[PDB]
Design a protein around this nucleic acid. Sequence first.
DNA 1: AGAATTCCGTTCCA
DNA 2: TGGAACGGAATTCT
Length: 266
Amino acid sequence: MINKKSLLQNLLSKCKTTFQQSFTNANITLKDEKWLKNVRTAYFVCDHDGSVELAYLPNVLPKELVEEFTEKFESIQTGRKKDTGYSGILDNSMPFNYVTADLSQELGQYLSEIVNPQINYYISKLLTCVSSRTINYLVSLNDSYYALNNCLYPSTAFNSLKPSNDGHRIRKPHKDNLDITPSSLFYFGNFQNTEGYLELTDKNCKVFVQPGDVLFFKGNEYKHVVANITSGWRIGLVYFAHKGSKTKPYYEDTQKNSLKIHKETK
DNA sequence: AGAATTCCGTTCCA
DNA sequence: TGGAACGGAATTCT
Ligand SMILES: O=C(O)CCC(=O)C(=O)O
Ligand SMILES: [Mn+2]
């Protein structure tokens, strides 16, 4: 119900001035139409209403930032058993929001205190361009969430993918169904141009992501999976918000403690 | 103690 | 519907 050529011109205009980069060979498709099979460049997916359900902007992060974060991420993850980590709040399995167990650890500290305040700026950049509805929602959240995660997004996921790990949750095709808003994704580490791509299975679209790129898309609606890497290290951050952020209460404590607090108020 | 297993609890889907 | 799934443990075995 709208012109895609003009909408792309609008999005490109905002993104060019905001990120101060020229995005060549940018493309736009409606969600109903046939998506590009291979996206190495700027790409946008919209509905009939005009809202952006996917945005991919190549290399918006300064190389100095990607390299420093990578080195620290790899340093911390070495001393970690699990291949995933989380900062901010999680409502998973509980009818309340709770502080992640990792926030007290080295990973959670580095994300919240150092990484997130810097990344929060590029998130602000991204949202003011592609989605107004998202940032309008994120600023309505409890102040405690913003203070906790030091970011507009109340929750941050840390995905460490080493070569030939098929057991990682991002290696299995899925949807994140708790998400009330499209997530913002940042990538780090080093891996090849032909591997570690995010594939949307139902739309048959392969987005090839490299360190420094940003990806903004709905995780609940579109089933997606991360491809295997034969070399390098694939590290990425997922900034999201669940439904429980608005709906469920907050006791300002970790999971087990909050459960005790939750019951005693009932 | 340091392994394997069960548990609390929400949400979904083949 | 059983059971896996962006958690995070406590029990229960060797
Ligand atoms: O890292 C990616 O490219 C995707 C992450 C993802 O799908 C998830 O965290 O569920
Ligand atoms: Mn996902």
